[PDB]
Amino acid sequence: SPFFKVKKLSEKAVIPTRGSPLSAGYDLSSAVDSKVPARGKALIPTDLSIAVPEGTYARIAPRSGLAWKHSIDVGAGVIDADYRGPVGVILFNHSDADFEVKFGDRIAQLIIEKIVTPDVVEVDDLD
Amino acid sequence: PSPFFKVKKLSEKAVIPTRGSPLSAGYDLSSAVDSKVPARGKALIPTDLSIAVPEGTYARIAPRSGLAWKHSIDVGAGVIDADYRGPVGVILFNHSDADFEVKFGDRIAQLIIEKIVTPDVVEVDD
Amino acid sequence: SPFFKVKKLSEKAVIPTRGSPLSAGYDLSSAVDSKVPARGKALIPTDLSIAVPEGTYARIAPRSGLAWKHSIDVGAGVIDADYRGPVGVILFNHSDADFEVKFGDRIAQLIIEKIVTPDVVEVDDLD
Ligand SMILES: [Mg+2]
């Protein structure tokens, strides 16, 4: 049984929702207004904590709009299934234009990616 | 299901994406146009393809390794839903101080069909 | 049955390890002293070769601390299940300060992502 458990850390938090029926990702909204300086970065809180199943992780993935319109990309974004701290989104601004994130703007989408995690076998030949 | 990958050409410039080694993750994507990705800038490179991938996956537009080292090229955005039937364009960021030229038919990215889970969003206090 | 095979290519390589039971990734360490120049890139050798199962790839993925503290991002990062050459991490530096890497520094994390690789078919009409 897959699951996506979400805890609001604030009254500011928006519960993530999927944008199309067969959408890969749950949209993540900013819990703050924040500058993202030209050629710099910002750490935007979501005011959520999450849990996802073992055998998956939550990837905070970029939105196509912020990227193509504002040259905004998402850094880091690997949220382990046992990570219970608050979810923040790191944004990089790859343009000479200051940008600003507004409270409640969708800044990323969370994608619950299937993975495997076997124990490493060291070999002298990989075959 | 049975997984599948259907592509529809939107012009005769589109190239059928193909894999590159039998256990290969990704299907090479070719540019449909002559264009460029400016130094320290960005471009949308059309593929002239529309695609379908199975429910419980998405198509990730992912960077080629050769272009990353040689041109400082990275893919922006790149999340194509199993739902999406519009044209597929590749957002490229150029993290160097020289323009990156693209000719029609060059490989500018690779598409990976990643398995995902899509449950309902269950709010808690944990 | 998933596996993760690793071959050391020198005594400078470190076997990737997972932080917690539910960690998505295996930490990767630099086999070299190097640097990522301000606004530039580097290829950092791992001195590893690897093999992962058919139906997966190894994604080279970013550490969040490095993203936030140093504006470090991972470029490239798609390692095919049948790629048997040396694993190098490409790093982009989205700040104006050079980033030093010391031999044994953790520079990325490896995630073994589940995928499908069906036979592509061109069609006249989409579903
Ligand atoms: Mg992925």
Class level of CATH domain B1-126: mainly beta
User: Minimal Cα–Cα distance from C33 to chain B, Å?
Assistant: 19
Q: Which of C50, C71, C113 sits opposite A41 (nearest CB)?
A: C71
Q: What spatial distance separates the first Cα and last Cα of chain B, rounded to whole Å?
A: 35
Q: How many CA atoms lie within 13 A of C37 on its CB side?
A: 7
DSSP label at residue A104: T
The contact set of B with A (CB < 8 A) is 40-42, 44, 55, 57-58, 74, 76-84, 91, 93, 95, 114-126
Provide the annotated binding site of A for Mg(2+): 113
- Residue C65 phi, psi (nearest 5): -60, -50
Give resolution, Å, one decimal: 2.2
Confirm if B10 and B50 have CB atoms less than 8 A apart. Answer: yes
User: Minimal Cα–Cα distance from A74 to chain B, Å?
Assistant: 9
Distance, CA of C49 to CA of A107 (rounded, Å): 36
Distance, CA of B62 to CA of B81 (rounded, Å): 14
Distance, CA of A18 to CA of B109 (rounded, Å): 26
Rounded-to-5 percentages of helix, strand, coil across chain B: 5, 45, 50
Amino acid at A115: I
Nearest to C52 by CA among C117, C111, C109, C10: C111
Distance, CA of A112 to CA of A54 (rounded, Å): 11
DSSP label at residue B18: B
Task: Output the six-digit token pair for B119.
Answer: 């449950």
Which residues have C-beta within 8 Å of that of residue C83, sequence separation ≥ 6? B21, C50
Structure method: X-ray
What distance in angstroms lies between residue A52's CA and the mean position of ligand 1's atoms? 15
Judging contacts by C-beta atoms under 8 Å, the chain A residues touching residue B72 are none
Confirm if A93 and A36 have CB atoms less than 8 A apart. Answer: yes
Task: Output the six-digit token pair for A47.
Answer: 């005011």
The contact set of C with B (CB < 8 A) is 39-41, 43, 54, 57, 73, 75-83, 90, 92, 94, 113-127
User: Minimal Cα–Cα distance from C125 to chain A, Å?
Assistant: 19
Q: Strands B5-9 and C120-122, how do they pair? A: parallel
DSSP label at residue A86: E
Judging contacts by C-beta atoms under 8 Å, the chain A residues touching residue B117 are 2, 4, 52-53, 56, 112, 114
Which chains does C contact via 3+ CB–CB distances below 8 A?
A, B
Element housing C69 (H / E): helix C64-70
Class level of CATH domain A1-127: mainly beta
